[PDB]
Amino acid sequence: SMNPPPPETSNPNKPKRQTNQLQYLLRVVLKTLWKHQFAWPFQQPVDAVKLNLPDYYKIIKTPMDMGTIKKRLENNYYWNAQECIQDFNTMFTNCYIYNKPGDDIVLMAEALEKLFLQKINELPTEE
Numbered sequence: 001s002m003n004p005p006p007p008e009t010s011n012p013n014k015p016k017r018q019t020n021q022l023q024y025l026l027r028v029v030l031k032t033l034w035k036h037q038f039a040w041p042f043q044q045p046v047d048a049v050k051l052n053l054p055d056y057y058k059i060i061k062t063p064m065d066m067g068t069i070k071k072r073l074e075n076n077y078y079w080n081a082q083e084c085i086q087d088f089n090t091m092f093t094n095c096y097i098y099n100k101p102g103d104d105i106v107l108m109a110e111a112l113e114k115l116f117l118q119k120i121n122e123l124p125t126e127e
């Protein structure tokens with residue numbers, strides 16, 4: 001089983017904004033998770049070929065990863081913070097749905113999700 005095309009990170013049709021909540025999502029939320037020891041499985045689209053996960057994209061129909069998120073943030077793909085928060089939550093959900101409780105990768109996602117929640121609890125006020 002081949003990999004699918006990755007999620008888009010560029011779309012000139014899509015209206016864009018650069019905003020203080022999006023800026024926080026990049027410089028605080030993404031940066032915190034990206035630097036973590038457990039980030040590496042989440043820093044790029046799942047390569048089902050290299051990882052020998054031939055059923056991954058049969059089960060996961062909304063792939064998402066931090067490499068995509070980082071590019072969406074840096075390339076101002078989003079209109080609002082909720083879009084980006086949803087991408088992180090999609091990524092965590094994918095991991096929990098595909099894998100088994102207690103698997104290493106689920107523990108890794110949990111650790112990142114804890115930090116995500118701690119940072120989005122203090123999402124700033126819109127300017």
Ligand SMILES: CCn1c(CSc2nc(N)n[nH]2)nc2c1c(=O)[nH]c(=O)n2Cc1ccc(Cl)cc1
Nearest residue numbers: 040041042044045046047051095098099104105
């Ligand atoms: C979170 C996505 N993911 C990736 C990362 S897919 C990847 N793509 C590329 N290019 N590098 N890593 N491995 C995964 C998964 C996933 O959901 N489920 C899995 O069982 N694996 C195998 C695995 C990898 C690392 C650890 Cl520590 C434990 C298990």
